[PDB]
Amino acid sequence: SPLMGGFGLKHPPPQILIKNTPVPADPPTTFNQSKLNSFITQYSTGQVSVEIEWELQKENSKRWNPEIQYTSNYYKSTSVDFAVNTEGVYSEPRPIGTRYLTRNL
Amino acid sequence: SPLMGGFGLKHPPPQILIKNTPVPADPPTTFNQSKLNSFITQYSTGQVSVEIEWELQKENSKRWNPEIQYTSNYYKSTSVDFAVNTEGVYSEPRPIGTRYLTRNL
Amino acid sequence: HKDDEERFFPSNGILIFGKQNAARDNADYSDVMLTSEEEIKTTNPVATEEYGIVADNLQQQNTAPQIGTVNSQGALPGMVWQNRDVYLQGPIWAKIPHTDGNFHP
């Protein structure tokens, strides 16, 4: 199990390598064996979609009293947590763990 | 809609009336027209089961930031909320409402 | 214990059963029944002895080699061992705690 947390996979999601294909600038009109180092300055943009299906383990608990749940703070604040501020900057105010429900050992 | 909250029903769950059938003590050996007022002292005990099926309206929300959730307090305390104390007395420490998730108007 | 040391036992490393009518607290040695796992001497280290000896430094022509006594040794590759014996008076099963990881549960 990976030490910084998560799922250890023998065959994880493969690395997806992307590169702009080099587009040479105008080569000389006399042949030169040297590799071309004059390239058209270039960048690419696009959209990337990743869809992950997760399987869930539903809690089947006979605990009587209410559990601890992750909740947003009810009290007023200058900005909404996990939202943008007045400058458009999205921020994550705290690290949300995963362990809130309880099980017996 | 009932003012103290809940579901207004034209035909609510019917009243379930229960009574110990009177068991007369020994009547006199000569006829008396008067209604009997001497009864064997009596009480009944038993188990009652009520099963209610509730339909749920699942939240279908595109809210980005986390919602307010009802949660138990994480901090230590003398007793567990919504549990029994050392004397076996079950107590409800607070009134838990129902409105924690959010909807747009 | 090792060979010819039946009188020795680990202080809290054996199952100790009480004889009939043994006191709950401060029962004498004659009132209890010490178990012995001497059968696993062949594979398991003696409970009251060190696992082995490891080097504690790098010997040079000016520094004599130093050895460290291993009093606690976790799992090493190639290690083999026997479990504790069961007893007529002893437990049969235990629930493996529901955890992410266990070693030889």
UniProtKB/TrEMBL annotation, chain C:
Similarity remark: Belongs to the parvoviridae capsid protein family.
Annotated source species: Adeno-associated virus 8 (AAV8)
Compartments in which it is found: Virion
Superkingdom of origin: Viruses
Protein's UniProt name: Capsid protein
